[PDB]
Amino acid sequence: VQLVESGGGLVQAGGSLRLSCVVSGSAVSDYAMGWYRQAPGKQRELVAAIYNSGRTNYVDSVKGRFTISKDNAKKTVYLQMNSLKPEDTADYFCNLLGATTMSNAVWGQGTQVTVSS
């Protein structure tokens, strides 16, 4: 299962970006996926999750601003990031839900997001 992230950039506070994660195989159609982020020198954290049923869950700090969705045909998980804040600056990664909990997790290259002033 390969993970390929894209969509980062440098934007002003209040701006918007759309991250995408293309997954090989049928994992998007069969398993819950999550978007994670790690700011320099801080611990990686789950930002948004989308379950097999289509149900979603977000950390309180992004609720109402970020929206996670998926397209089974395109094997892609999206993170629409609106009303970006400087606290959202981080490297963003997507992976199976439960990959971070297990030991010896494999991650992709990620995509970098910077929200300036």
Measured in residues, the chain has a length of: 117
Q: For residues 86 and 84, what is the distance between their CA atoms, to the nearest angstrom?
A: 7
Instruction: Write out the two tokens for 32.
Output: 């819950």
* Count of structural domains within the chain: 1
Within 10 A of 17 (CB to CB), how many other CB atoms are there?
21
The experimental technique behind this entry is X-ray
Q: For residues 50 and 28, what is the distance between their CA atoms, to the nearest angstrom?
A: 10
The neighbouring-strand residues paired with 112 are 91
Q: For residues 9 and 11, what is the distance between their CA atoms, to the nearest angstrom?
A: 6
- SS3 annotation, 9-57: EEECCCCCEEEEEEECCCHHHHCCEEEEEECCCCCCEEEEEECCCCCEE
CATH number where 99 lies: 2.60.40.10
Which range marks the domain in which residue 92 is found?
A: 1-117
